[PDB]
Curated annotation (Swiss-Prot):
CDD domains: Porin3_VDAC
Entry keyword NAD: yes
GO MF term list: ATP binding; ceramide binding; cholesterol binding; identical protein binding; oxysterol binding; phosphatidylcholine binding; porin activity; protein kinase binding
Function summary: Non-selective voltage-gated ion channel that mediates the transport of anions and cations through the mitochondrion outer membrane and plasma membrane. The channel at the outer mitochondrial membrane allows diffusion of small hydrophilic molecules; in the plasma membrane it is involved in cell volume regulation and apoptosis. It adopts an open conformation at low or zero membrane potential and a closed conformation at potentials above 30-40 mV. The open state has a weak anion selectivity whereas the closed state is cation-selective.
Keyword tags: Acetylation, Apoptosis, ATP-binding, Cell membrane, Ion transport, Isopeptide bond, Lipid transport, Lipid-binding, Membrane, Mitochondrion, Mitochondrion outer membrane, NAD, Nucleotide-binding, Phosphoprotein, Porin, Transmembrane, Transmembrane beta strand, Transport, Ubl conjugation
Binding site for NAD(+): 242-244, 260-264
Family the UniProt entry places it in: Belongs to the eukaryotic mitochondrial porin family.
Annotated positions of the N6-acetyllysine modification: 20, 109, 252, 266
UniProt domain comment: Consists mainly of a membrane-spanning beta-barrel formed by 19 beta-strands. The helical N-terminus folds back into the pore opening and plays a role in voltage-gated channel activity.
UniProt-recorded name of the protein: Non-selective voltage-gated ion channel VDAC1
Gene3D superfamilies in alphabetical order: Porin
Highest taxon of the lineage: Eukaryota
Amino acid sequence: MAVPPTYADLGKSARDVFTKGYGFGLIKLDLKTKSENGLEFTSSGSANTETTKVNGSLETKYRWTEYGLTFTEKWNTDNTLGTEITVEDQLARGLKLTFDSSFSPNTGKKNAKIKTGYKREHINLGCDVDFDIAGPSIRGALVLGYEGWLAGYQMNFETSKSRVTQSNFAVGYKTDEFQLHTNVNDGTEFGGSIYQKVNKKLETAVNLAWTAGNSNTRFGIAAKYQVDPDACFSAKVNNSSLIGLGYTQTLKPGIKLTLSALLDGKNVNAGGHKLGLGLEFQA
C-alpha cells in the first residue's frame, strides 16, 4: 500500500491493458489448477499459425504456506528443465530469497540465479545475481515512495566486461484509479504511460516512447471494457496504424475463450491479418 512496487512493476497496469486479452497469430491452450497451498499445476501449449511450430510447457508448484516456501518445477518441449525455491517473509517480513536452476540437455548448458528483494513502507529493493558462464552479472533495483510519488533506479553489472551495461531511471505517480509512469533507459530511450481506471468497467491506457536523438515518436491508445462478468472487450491503436481487437468470453465456469485480431491500416481487410485463439481451463 505504502509499500511501493518493484522496479519492473512500475507501469505494469498500463502494460496490462495493452497485452492482456490479445494473442495474435497463436492458438493457445492453457490448463491450470489452484491451491492456496499444496500442489498447483499449469500446463500450456501454443501453436504459431505462421510457422506451424508447436510449443508446450508444464509447471509444478508446491506451497508450504507455513514456512513461506514455494518449490516450483519447470519443463518445456525445448527440453529445458527448471527448479525454483522461494522463501518469503521468513527471516524478516518482507524479505524474499530465490534460488533458481536451469539445465538444458539440449546443450548441456546450465544456469543458476539468486534473486533477493526487501520491501517495506516507502522502500522496495532488489539484488539479482546471474551465475551465467560469461556472467556473473548483477542487477540491482531500488524504488522509493513519497505520498503517491515513486522514483527508482535499476542497474546491471556484467563482470566479464566489468561494466555497467544498463542504467535506468523511472519516476511516476500512482493511485488506485490513476497511474503516471515515465522512464529513460541508458539515457537513451524515453517512455511514459498513463493508466486510468475510469470506472468499474473501463480501463484506458496511453503509451509514449521515443529515442534520443531521433525526432520520431511512437504512441498507442488502448482500453479494456468489462461488458458483463463473463465477457470482456479490448481495443488498441498505435501510430504505426495497427489495430488490436480482443474478445474474451466465459463459455462455462472454468472455461474462457478469447478471439483476437490485429489489423494494418489502410489495408483492412485488404491484405493478410493476424488472428488468434486461446482457451483457458481452470480447475
